[PDB]
Structure formats: C-alpha cells, structure tokens
C-alpha cells in the first residue's frame, strides 16, 4: 500500500494586527477541514519584489498565530517558513515540527544548528540566488536537473555536518522564479523529479499557482488551478512526499489519483 502525499496547506501571515489572529484560526480550521496534514505559517514573503523583514517583525507576525492555533487546534501539525535561526528557534519551542528554509540553510549560519537541536524536520529548497528573496531573472541552464541535484546533495551534506540526520532532511527542487523566470526549467524538474530520490530524502514541492503555470494563454493566478492540479499530481507520480498548496481540497483530490496510479496490483 503506497502512502498518500502529505498536503501542506499555506497560511500566510503577511493599529490592527490582532484582527489577523482570530481569522488565522478560522483559516487554519478550513485548511484542516479540506484535508491538509500540515499548516504552514510564514511571516515573510520571499517571491520576486519582496523585501527583508527583521526577526522582530517576523516573530511579531507569526508568534500570536502559532499560539492561537496551538490553543484552538491542538492536534494540528505546524510548519514555519523562515530562513532566520532566531525565528526557527521560537517556532520550535512553541511546537512547530517543520522548518521550511527557502535559502537551504545559507542565509543564517545558525539555523542548521537550531534545527539539529530539535526533533523537527527541515525543508531545504533550491534557489538560483543566494538572497532568500528571489529575483526576476530568466536564468538559463545547460542541465537544470544536474545543477539542482548537485546543489541539494551539497546542502544535505552541510545539514548532516551540522547535526541533522538524513531522516529529518526534506528536499525541494524549487519551482517557478526560484528556479528561473523561464518556465521550461520548472517543467524539466517535474519531469525528472524521480532522479532526486537517489539523495535518500523525502521530497517536497510547491507548484501552487506559480507563474510557470501561466502557459500559452498567459493565465493569471485565478485561472491556474487546473495546471496546479496537473503539476501537483505529476509531482506525486514522480516521487513527491509533500505538496504545499493554497487549494487543499482540489490538490489533495488530484494527488490521490496520482497515488492510485502509483499503486501496484495485488501481489
């Protein structure tokens, strides 16, 4: 029996900041209602055009939300999106069990150790830039699969050297602008995702209505749900163990079909 994918539901937190906390719990409950396995909280955007926020601002955004979710939804599994060691440290103390670092441990030399001194998992994503805030850039590649594979191999090596065992390391190839503002490279990584299973780590991907799904029609975000379903399903077909998404209900259901296709006949 092949296990289904774990669905990671996005809960972004980016005078009146207390109005967000009650609404965050309502949103988290809806994500769980739709079948999310993990609620992913983040207080700092890192897409193109984003700017750096301080650790104090980042904590001020996510800590009230973590506390409220831990109190009202106590069995909910929490992940926190951060590249800052101080933020990861507080998140882990409050009960988060996953840290997702879009810098793959590069932005803060202390973050690996913080996670090493926990029982949390870390997600290491490939990005074409050193700055966790990714750029608009039509980066080309001779062989994006080789580039990303070797990058993730090296980041896994670094995470293990800092004390994180392989079984708490999750790898993400990146998709969309993190890989390139040219969409072809995201499709190539999805095509060859099974090659990354040789690194011995669970795989996490996030098609999530990214602009590489705009296609020939130049589809805006509201029109990218069919493409997000198709990409997330093929990612699972090709070895994804986690899918991060805003559309938990539909992507869970589409991924269940991928799992069923991967299921070998009766033995």
Ligand X SMILES: Nc1nc2ncc(CO)nc2c(=O)[nH]1
**Residues binding ligand X (CB under 6 A):** 46-47, 81, 100, 102, 123, 125, 172, 174-176, 204, 206, 210, 244
Q: Which among 114, 197, 199, 107 has a CA at the least distance from the CA of 151?
A: 199
Q: Which among 132, 59, 73, 123 has a CA at the least distance from the CA of 97?
A: 123
Contact positions with Cl ion (CB under 5 A) in 78-117: 117
Site string for a second copy, 188-227 (x = CB under 8 A): x-xx---------------------x-xxx-x---x-xxx
How many other CB atoms sit within 10 Å of the CB of residue 219? Answer: 16
> Choosing among ligand X, Cl ion, a second copy, none, which partner's interface includes residue 206 (Cβ < 5 to 8 Å by kind)?
ligand X
DSSP character string of 30-70? HHHHTT-SEEEEESS--STT-----HHHHHHHHHHHHHHHH
Contact positions with a second copy (CB under 8 A) in 120-179: 143-144
Please say whether the beta carbons of 174 and 127 come within 8 A. Answer: yes
> Choosing among ligand X, Cl ion, a second copy, none, which partner's interface includes residue 117 (Cβ < 5 to 8 Å by kind)?
Cl ion
Q: For residues 71 and 129, which CB has a smaller minimum distance to ligand X in the complex?
A: 129
> Which residues of this protein are in contact with a second copy, per CB under 8 A?
143-144, 183-184, 187-188, 190-191, 213, 215-217, 219, 223, 225-227, 229-231, 233-234, 237, 249-251, 253-258, 260-263, 265-266
């Amino acid at each position: 029996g092949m296990a289904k994918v774990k669905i990671v539901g996005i809960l972004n937190v980016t005078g009146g900041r207390f109005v967000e906390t009650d609404k965050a719990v309502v949103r988290a409950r809806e994500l769980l209602s739709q079948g999310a396995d993990i609620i992913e909280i983040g207080g700092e955007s890192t897409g193109p055009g984003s700017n750096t926020i301080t650790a104090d601002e980042e904590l001020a955004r996510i800590v009230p939300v973590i506390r409220a979710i831990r109190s009202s939804l106590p069995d909910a599994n929490i992940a926190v999106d951060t590249y800052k060691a101080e933020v990861a440290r507080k998140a882990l103390e409050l009960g988060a069990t996953m840290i997702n670092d879009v810098s793959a441990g590069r932005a803060d030399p202390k973050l690996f150790g913080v996670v090493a001194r926990s029982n949390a998992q870390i997600v290491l994503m490939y990005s074409k830039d050193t700055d966790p805030h990714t750029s608009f850039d039509e980066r080309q590649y001779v062989d994006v699969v080789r580039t990303v594979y070797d990058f993730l191999a090296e980041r896994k090596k670094a995470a293990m050297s800092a004390g994180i065992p392989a079984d708490r390391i999750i790898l993400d190839t990146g998709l969309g602008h993190f890989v390139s503002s040219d969409p072809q490279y995201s499709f190539q990584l999805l095509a060859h995702l099974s090659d990354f299973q040789d690194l011995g780590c669970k795989l996490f991907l996030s098609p999530s209505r990214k602009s590489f799904l705009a296609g020939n029609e130049l589809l805006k975000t509201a029109d990218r749900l069919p493409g997000t379903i198709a990409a997330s399903a093929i990612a699972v077909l090709h070895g994804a163990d986690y899918i991060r998404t805003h559309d938990v209900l539909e992507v869970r259901r589409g991924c269940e079909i991928a799992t069923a296709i991967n299921q070998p006949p009766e033995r």
